[PDB]
Amino acid sequence: RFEDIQAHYDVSDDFFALFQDPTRTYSCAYFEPPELTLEEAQYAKVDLNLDKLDLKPGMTLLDIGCGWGTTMRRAVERFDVNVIGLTLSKNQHARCEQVLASIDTNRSRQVLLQGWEDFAEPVDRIVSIEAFEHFGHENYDDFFKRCFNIMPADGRMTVQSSVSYHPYEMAARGKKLSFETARFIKFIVTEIFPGGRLPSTEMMVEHGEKAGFTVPEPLSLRPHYIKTLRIWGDTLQSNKDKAIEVTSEEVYNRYMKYLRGCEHYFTDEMLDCSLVTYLKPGAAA
Ligand SMILES: Cc1ccc2oc(=O)ccc2c1
Ligand SMILES: Cc1ccc2oc(=O)ccc2c1
């Protein structure tokens, strides 16, 4: 029943196409250098993640939340690795299968319609780009234990996740702004990512360490998300008429509120986006 209440907030892939770049990447871009197009910045974000993973030819990369398959293809093409992708979306599964089958390679390419809970095959390296927000706090210990256990002695993982701060830390940066941010987060995890729950950077780090990972200083992507959300918002606005035709005025207003609102709270430093690297004890220096 509560699912039905959330099922209300389901939106066609066609709507997201009207604000996203041509790769349909629904995560923080990386504008390095600063004058990259959104689309180029999305390839630079993939490279930022993959370049941290010490990927060698013939290794297997696991992509947890593999989206439309952009990260896996880039991995196969750049690093000559086997790939396994996990997605819960039937549409993303079908697209990924086609993206991977198109690649000129002898490497193994696999996409599975399942969550990480059901995945227990040996892999060399793991990437997860803005899927972690959906796992839930109670599942973090199981997540990091699974990732540690499926990787070899030199295993590495990157997790990119939107984050909030502990209530105590939020209170420290103005009471007014603290309650305002909490209410906007509640809107995101009700109407935009139903059942979602933002971790803190500290949770991401400490759950990793409990599992046995070495965790260097997380990379903040805050200024890159501000630019991403600005372009998304401006793009949705430019396509207002088409967006309404495809869904409704309700859904257009909901997403403009989300995109403008996120840009605001990222600017006010009440939200962040953390790229966290997890190194197993035997990882290369
Ligand atoms: C279903 C669908 C159709 C076209 C697309 O174009 C892209 O480049 C990436 C994602 C995508 C997904
Ligand atoms: C589940 C989920 C995924 C992405 C998110 O991005 C945000 O900025 C805030 C909340 C959030 C929640």
Domain ranges in the chain? 1-285
Assess whether 273 carries a catalytic annotation.
no
- Could you give the CA distance from residue 159 to residue 211 in angstroms, rounded to a whole number? 15
Phi, psi of 164 (to 5 degrees): -115, 180
Where does ligand 1 bind, in terms of residues with CB under 6 Å? 13, 22-24, 68, 91, 95
- Could you give the CA distance from residue 215 to residue 52 in angstroms, rounded to a whole number? 12
Ligand 2 contact via 134 beta carbon (within 6 Å): yes
Q: How far is the CA of 162 from the centre of ligand 2 (A)?
A: 6
Ligand 2 contact via 36 beta carbon (within 6 Å): no
CB atoms within 10 A of CB 26: 15
Q: How far is the CA of 79 from the centre of ligand 1 (A)?
A: 23
Tokens representing 102?
Answer: 């198109």
Closest to 212 (Cα-Cα) out of 159, 283, 275:
283
Task: Please give the DSSP secondary-structure letter assigned to residue 139.
Answer: G
For ligand 1, atom 8, the nearest C-alpha belongs to 23
Q: Which atom of ligand 1 is nearest to the CA of 94?
A: 1
- Could you give the CA distance from residue 233 to residue 237 in angstroms, rounded to a whole number? 6
Q: Is 90 exposed, middle or buried (0-12, 13-18, 19+ CB in 10 A)?
A: exposed
Q: How far is the CA of 257 from the centre of ligand 1 (A)?
A: 25
Q: Which amino acid is at 19?
A: F
Q: Is 202 exposed, middle or buried (0-12, 13-18, 19+ CB in 10 A)?
A: middle
Ligand number nearest to the C-alpha of 129: 2
Q: Which atom of ligand 2 is nearest to the CA of 164?
A: 9
- Could you give the CA distance from residue 232 to residue 255 in angstroms, rounded to a whole number? 10
Closest to 232 (Cα-Cα) out of 256, 198, 254:
256
Q: Can you give the resolution of this entry in Å?
A: 1.9
First to last CA, the chain: 50
Rounded to 5°, the CA angle 149-153-154 comes to: 115
Q: Among the options 28, 147, 262, 273, which is catalytic?
A: 262
**CB 65 within 8 Å of CB 89:** no
Helices 90-102, 70-79: crossing angle, 10 deg rounding: 20
Ligand 2 contact via 63 beta carbon (within 6 Å): no
